[PDB]
Amino acid sequence: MREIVHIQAGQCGNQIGAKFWEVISDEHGIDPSGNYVGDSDLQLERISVYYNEASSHKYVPRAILVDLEPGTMDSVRSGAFGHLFRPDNFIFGQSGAGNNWAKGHYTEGAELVDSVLDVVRKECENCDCLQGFQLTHSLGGGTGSGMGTLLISKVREEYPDRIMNTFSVVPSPKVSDTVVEPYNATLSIHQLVENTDETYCIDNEALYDICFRTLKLATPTYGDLNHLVSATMSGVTTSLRFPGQLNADLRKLAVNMVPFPRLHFFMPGFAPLTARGSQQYRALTVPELTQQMFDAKNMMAACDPRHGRYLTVATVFRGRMSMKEVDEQMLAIQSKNSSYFVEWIPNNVKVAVCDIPPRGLKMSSTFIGNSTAIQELFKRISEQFTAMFRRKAFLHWYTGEGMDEMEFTEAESNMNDLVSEYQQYQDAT
Amino acid sequence: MREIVHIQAGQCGNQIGAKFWEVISDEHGIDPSGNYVGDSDLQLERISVYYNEASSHKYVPRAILVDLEPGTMDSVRSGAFGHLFRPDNFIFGQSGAGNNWAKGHYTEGAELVDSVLDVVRKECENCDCLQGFQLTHSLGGGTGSGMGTLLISKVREEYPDRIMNTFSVVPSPKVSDTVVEPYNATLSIHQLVENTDETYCIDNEALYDICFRTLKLATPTYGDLNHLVSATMSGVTTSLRFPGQLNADLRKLAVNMVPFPRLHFFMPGFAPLTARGSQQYRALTVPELTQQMFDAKNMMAACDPRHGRYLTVATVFRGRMSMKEVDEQMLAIQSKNSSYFVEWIPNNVKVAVCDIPPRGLKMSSTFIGNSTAIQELFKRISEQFTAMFRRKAFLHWYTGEGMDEMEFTEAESNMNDLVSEYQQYQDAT
Amino acid sequence: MRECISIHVGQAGVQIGNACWELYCLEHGIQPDGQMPHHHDSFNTFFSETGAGKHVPRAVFVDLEPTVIDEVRTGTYRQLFHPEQLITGKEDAANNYARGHYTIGKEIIDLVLDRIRKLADQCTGLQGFLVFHSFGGGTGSGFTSLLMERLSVDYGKKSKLEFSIYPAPQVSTAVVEPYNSILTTHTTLEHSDCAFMVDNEAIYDICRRNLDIERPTYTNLNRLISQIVSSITASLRFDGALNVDLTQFQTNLVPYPRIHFPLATYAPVISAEKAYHEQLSVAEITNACFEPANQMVKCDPRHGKYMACCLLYRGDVVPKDVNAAIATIKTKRSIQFVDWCPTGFKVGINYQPPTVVPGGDLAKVQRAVCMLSNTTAIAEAWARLDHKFDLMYAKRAFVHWYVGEGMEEGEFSEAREDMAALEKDYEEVGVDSVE
């Protein structure tokens, strides 16, 4: 009931998804072979939302892993946790997009999308009652950004009356992984703003600091970095996967959070984050949980909220608490930190409570804040994209595979408009 | 309830505190591992004042140990009694202040003062009522005096309606540990007399003499020296940690003993002080205890009271007695020694009685006297500072890191004013 | 039927009340937990009756610091008190009058008034308030002056009895006592109907000499004062051949509205071994209580005059030799009364002998005399305490703590001239009147 479709694009999506389906398997008591070995029947109460029933009590995920370059798939197939996926879903192309938008939207986008859309339709018809779509990708790569935009569009005419959540890894200010980031990002964001519902922007170096500073890890690899982002992603969904005292669903989050069609870029955060050695000297209690969430340091996006104002805020608890303690503390937060909240939405705190605590923790929480601190992220990206484009650098290889200058002019004009409306509403009276 | 924050600055504060939390742990029946192993229930009646309740009945002290160099924390962290502090509290820098005021208040202190201040605000949010701050530092070092004053000015801004006590270690008149003492001390006092409520001045040679003749020890190391100052420091606080016939607390002492805003420099003292061998030839009873404290020999500050007059006096008894025997002796002390008391404060004796004896003792006492004889101590220090400053010796390395000539002129101009009023009130009619 | 509520502020009030309420439960034969092992109402005046067999007192324990109330909660008398009435603050006044009357005391005075109103509505024939407050403390002196203002406005004209602890001349535990005592007296001079005074050292001489005790803990001192506290309200809870209720003391011991400062006394107070060698007759306990050395305030009566007196016998007492004993007492020239009071004695007899708690320093006696004297001899103590105040205030010592907590310097001047007026009147009416 209320089934969810999970789509993966680019190298990041497959690596994040590899850690994702690891978390879900432990949550639902699923052996790597694919057979139920747990005890509680509560996990079976709603198992069809993600997994799928099969013969001999086998379970297969509703995931569609697809990427142009094959190199990622041999890793997921040959590696562990590859005995439970559906071999038909393992879609791959022939050559990677090469960090090019054009090769991800016109050249190799044509033949690959037709194949992947077929598996979506078959998966949708198998579904009993569709709830929405989940897409995990990156805005810096070529295949994940370029094709993911194409897939988001092709899905959109097919299911107009549906919602989707895109958990994108937005590029960093400090360190840039690839040289031509702004060309892929600016083009991708223009299309997403047109035809998407909500978007959870996530940074890398911000999660780098969190792992090194708070968890005190000397060598934070991609294994640990992707592990933390999976827990936030599992926390967002678990409201409808598991019963709770004040339940919420993907539809509830979308409407509570998005006041306007063009302002749907969120910023997540998770708590508690404690080291292995320092967990014994801290009291696991709601006061410190909410305090840990509401500081700039424990935030998974590299934008300090102090330069902006929280437009709307969510908080999806887990474990067992009191609504009194939960909402008494939201009062203490609101009264003390009132200078940082937008004046013209009152009571802008949405709270939901579950009952199943996360593994190895008495209780935890997930904070999703639609803030005005993203305006500094888009301003910087637009600045980087502007200077590079005026001198017409790297342009010969987007023009040489389908596009021309009119796409670049209109994408820049739209992005300037969006940051204009974003600021003009923050400074409204 | 009525919690207090304990701050340690410099090497002395860390060394005093390392053995201070030794005596506090025995009083509350705390194993070195951090778990309660005591018997009497009265210990847990007020345990939150110093320790913090945590998961699985573990207790974590409310301490903030900070030094500009890592040479001090290596001992406490690696050594015993280091598995119960919270590692977040173990704040340290990279290079010591180097016995310089500038390198601890202007240049190097500012970098680390933001980290400790943020811990202070985070320190006892769980803590529900602040009673005050307890600071242990030195007036001769660089980090103990330099940034310790920096913390006092900054902390006072955030908690103005609160009282704090600094248990400083005032310099010596016979042997000086560091060559540039008067420059470091005088610059500190000009800032201390403005942002503190009361200061406990303690010497070292006076502690040496007491441990030599009275305790019969020929080679007292720093371990046997700091044990004497811990008991006095624990005696002042234990009024609000344990029940008593006539209770007192930190706020109570400040009212009785600060007649004027600038005259808040006290002189402690402890009794009984008897050797282990010669403990069988004395009868433990109130008669000798009151006589023991009021002689010049058993005084922890090297200033002979006979050259001055007591203004106000404490006697924070412990153990169990009858207040009649207490006031029968305070009457005998007053009548026989009436020449050593100021005329314009009648009945200037404050007495409080507790109900829990110190460890291995039937009864004990703590004497705190806001005597006038301190005026001879500041007279000597201002004499040494004057001789060094006209020659401008050692000064080319104070202006080179932030200061100038005008600052030194005002610090001495204010200090001679303080010794003027400290004596003008003694001779006032 | 007849109701009076007891308020205990400060550590002095709570500690005294722990022993005072320790004695009532023994006079009325109730166990500490409310069960039972003369008796026929009686207990309706102090012990409110719950539907079950348990009785709970009409007490209001209020303090600003929680150190002493927790002793009561965890003490042996834990199931007796009503858990709501034990009101605790967070931190005390730190022997500061300004703190406990302006800043922190104001933030909690509404909570205690709430429980006062709930307790008064539960009763029917309320008469007055018994306040056990000290003088030198912070929450026992400044906070109780606030309660007088709150109680007086709510209840217009009711007797307001106070059992103070007069600061001692030579004994002094606090350093700022002359500042607290002068301030609290000037404000309670108009909202108090009569204030009994007790000196802490005065019992010590009594306990050392008469009791023959070398271990005078605060428990031993507090046990002895509670006997006076109980026996003053002995006629309300017990029948008597000449009953005296709380309203008589207001009109028998208060010749003038300002001069309402009597002092207590108890007799006989003798040990157990000395009990055998004493006959303990009515003619001597009247003489013992009138002796100068048995007074419970460190002021000798010989330097002053007795304005009025009041005796409250109990037990095997005949109203004949009682009449005879006072007859010779008035004749005796050691004690002198004021001219305009030809009769200066009030008597009350009761049929219930006082009881003795187990292990007490006092010995069981079939008779007891409790003497409350309004006298001119207390005027000397006021002048002395006034001398200390003007000495400290001359140099403005300790002033900065008060002015920084919500007072002006002009207020200190008014409290000074007020005590000048009280002291001059205390001797102006005590001197002979011409014609």
Ligand SMILES: Nc1nc2c(ncn2[C@@H]2O[C@H](COP(=O)(O)OP(=O)(O)OP(=O)(O)O)[C@@H](O)[C@H]2O)c(=O)[nH]1
């Ligand atoms: N969080 C996270 N991000 C990653 C990880 N690996 C790569 N990324 C991000 O993903 C981007 C890589 O772009 P992709 O879309 O994966 O490109 P690709 O899959 O190699 O194929 P092409 O687009 O054709 O190059 C980089 O900019 C990284 O910032 C990862 O393991 N975890």
Ligand SMILES: Nc1nc2c(ncn2[C@@H]2O[C@H](COP(=O)(O)OP(=O)(O)OP(=O)(O)O)[C@@H](O)[C@H]2O)c(=O)[nH]1
């Ligand atoms: N009572 C006591 N005093 C000590 C002890 N150790 C050092 N001191 C005093 O502390 C002073 C040393 O200055 P500190 O404040 O420790 O200087 P620091 O912490 O090493 O930092 P720097 O000033 O930069 O060197 C000396 O004058 C000693 O009198 C100790 O173990 N017990």
Ligand SMILES: Nc1nc2c(ncn2[C@@H]2O[C@H](COP(=O)(O)OP(=O)(O)OP(=O)(O)O)[C@@H](O)[C@H]2O)c(=O)[nH]1
């Ligand atoms: N008779 C008697 N007097 C006491 C006792 N305890 C304290 N006192 C008196 O109380 C005076 C001290 O002031 P308190 O009223 O006790 O102070 P407090 O009650 O703690 O309230 P704060 O001043 O705010 O701390 C002393 O001078 C004592 O004479 C007691 O147990 N019995």
Ligand SMILES: [Mg+2]
């Ligand atoms: Mg790739």
Ligand SMILES: [Mg+2]
């Ligand atoms: Mg050092």
Ligand SMILES: [Mg+2]
């Ligand atoms: Mg008190």
